Paper text:
Here, we present crystal structures of unphosphorylated RcsB in complex with the consensus DNA-binding sequence of 22-mer (DNA22) and 18-mer (DNA18) of the flhDC operon from Escherichia coli determined at 3.15- and 3.37-Å resolution, respectively. The asymmetric unit of the RcsB crystal in complex with DNA22 contained one RcsB dimer bound to one double helix DNA, whereas the RcsB crystal in complex with DNA18 contained an RcsB tetramer (two RcsB dimers) bound to two parallel double helical DNAs. In both crystal forms, the RcsB dimers displayed similar structures, and the DNA had a classical B form with an average base pair rise and twist of 3.2 Å and 34°, respectively; the DNA was slightly bent along the surfaces of the RcsB HTH domains. The RcsB dimer observed in two different crystal forms is asymmetric. The subunits in the dimer were not related by a two-fold rotation axis of symmetry. Instead, an approximate two-fold axis was present between each of the RcsB domains of a dimer. However, these two axes met each other at an angle of about 120°. In the RcsB-DNA complex, the helices that form the HTH DNA recognition motif of the DNA-binding domain (α8 and α9) bound to the floor of the DNA major groove perpendicular to the DNA helical axis. K180 and S184, located on helix α9, made hydrogen bonds (H-bonds) with G-8, A−9 and A−6 in one-half-site (TTAGGAA) or with G−30, A−31, and A−28 in its complement (TCTAAGA) on the other half-site of the DNA. The side chain amino group of K192 in the RcsB-DNA22 complex contributes to electrostatic interactions, but it is too far away for a direct H-bond.
Numbering used by the authors:
A (entry chain A): 2 to 141, 148 to 209
B (entry chain B): 2 to 125, 131 to 141, 149 to 207
DNA sequence: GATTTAGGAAAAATCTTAGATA
DNA sequence: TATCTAAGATTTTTCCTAAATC
């Protein structure tokens, strides 16, 4: 019935915001606020807590951030239910976080009543998906072929398409075709978006 | 004597946060919260308001965002004092924003008290703008074009948004890269995240 | 039976340059 | 002096479409 929450976000003004917005829900209890991964993981065993609410990227270098951070948490506190609350509009990175079996994603964009919804579905033992989230996942075997991986690696290294083409003794259109379809598979629409995925799981 | 604030940020959870933290200060009045540039500029004349508190980037395509958006505001409501509350430790982009002559910056990182400080200095030359200044500088368009790019927008798309030619925007991006001593798009973005 | 490879067509982004601004 | 703008020819990349490969 009653609920124990830990909030982790590196923007203190946001942390304040989540605390104040969660303060409203009388079956929720804020039990720790944390600003880095390290303070978080150190105090995790100390608070019996049901729910962790985190952003992806934050400071904290021994335990990391993003996927890594969580994966560590699911591994070591499997009892603990994580909601990711992110600014991240990237379909692929969100998609990777959903392959982790977490209990929620909630974008920081247009989601005033989303969090309470996300948390309320956690009592029910159900998942919530913001309309905003599923919209972001509309683009989406999504696993990529060996050439596709190569072409992508080289690209994520700084190499240009025409340069990749020279290196692998293949046509520019071949390499572009390869990159382009990798991006299709990954549900990612532009180079900025691709590179950001490419450093998320890396 | 009393103070009227308009808050504009696209994260509603954050908007809530700022409203609740400002709610504490009895000589401050939240008079409008806004989530895009267009709703903001449309309601600007409707609220006699002293202070706009904004992030850089938000939706709103008639009037844009960031520098452009600000500059539009200082042009049309020069009475209005803007505090920018932003979420990036990019030195270059911030550099351009501090050359803008607004009446406050506050980073979203580590600044629970900074916002009422910023507002309180406005009662009584800029302290807040002084505060992290120490920490090859790029031109206002150059910063914008770069920001927008690093936001995921394509050169062609940037061009559409700003009602300017693709060659203008490319020329701007390219020279920003030159200023920054960076060779290619991969290299630029990687800088842009430090 | 999907991946690997490209052709021409096409569009997107850069290398010029150059007037204008301020 | 540095910055804002964009036409002009050029380069890079993608769109569309289709062949051999494995």
């Amino acid at each position: 019935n009653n609920m124990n929450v830990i909030i982790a976000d590196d923007h203190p003004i946001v942390l304040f915001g989540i605390r104040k917005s969660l303060e409203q829900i009388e079956w929720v209890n804020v039990v720790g606020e944390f600003e880095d991964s390290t303070a978080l993981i150190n105090n995790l065993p100390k608070l019996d807590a049901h729910v962790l609410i985190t952003d992806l990227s934050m400071p904290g270098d021994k335990y990391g951030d993003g996927i890594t951070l969580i994966k560590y948490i699911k591994r070591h506190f499997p009892s603990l239910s994580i909601i990711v609350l992110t600014m991240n509009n990237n379909p692929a990175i969100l998609s990777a976080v959903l392959d982790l079996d977490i209990e929620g994603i909630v974008l920081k964009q247009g989601a005033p009543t989303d969090l309470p919804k996300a948390l309320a579905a956690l009592q029910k033992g159900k998942k919530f998906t913001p309309e905003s989230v599923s919209r972001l996942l509309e683009k989406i075997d999504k696993r990529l072929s060996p050439k596709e991986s190569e072409v992508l690696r080289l690209f994520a290294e700084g190499f240009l398409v025409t340069e990749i083409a020279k290196k692998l003794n293949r046509s520019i259109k071949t390499i572009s075709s390869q990159k382009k379809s990798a991006m299709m598979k990954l549900g990612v629409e532009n180079d900025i978006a691709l590179l950001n995925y490419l450093s998320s799981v890396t």
